Write a protein that binds this ligand. Structure first.
Ligand SMILES: [Zn+2]
Ligand SMILES: [Zn+2]
Ligand SMILES: [Zn+2]
Ligand SMILES: [Zn+2]
Lengths: 68, 9
């Protein structure tokens, strides 16, 4: 009864739904930011520009959801 | 901001 029906929780598979939305990679979930609009996950280092730390502010919006 | 998970220091 997998948590993610898309990848079936298969650690061998990339998944842009339950892992990094940009690269699909599963590593470093402690460095994957959650977007406060779409609730997808983004490695800090997959962003443009890449970030070296988790932002301090409570609310963060991914490139797909943020104001331009 | 929120992260997907946390990790031990
Ligand atoms: Zn998945
Ligand atoms: Zn998308
Ligand atoms: Zn990534
Ligand atoms: Zn978003």
């Amino acid at each position: 009864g997998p948590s993610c029906k898309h990848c079936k929780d298969d650690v061998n598979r990339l998944c842009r739904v339950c892992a990094c939305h940009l690269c699909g990679g599963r590593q470093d979930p402690d460095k994957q930011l959650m977007c406060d609009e779409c609730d997808m996950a983004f490695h800090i280092y997959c962003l443009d520009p890449p970030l070296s730390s988790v932002p301090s502010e409570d609310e963060w919006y991914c490139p797909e959801c943020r104001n331009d | 901001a929120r992260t997907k998970q946390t990790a031990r220091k």
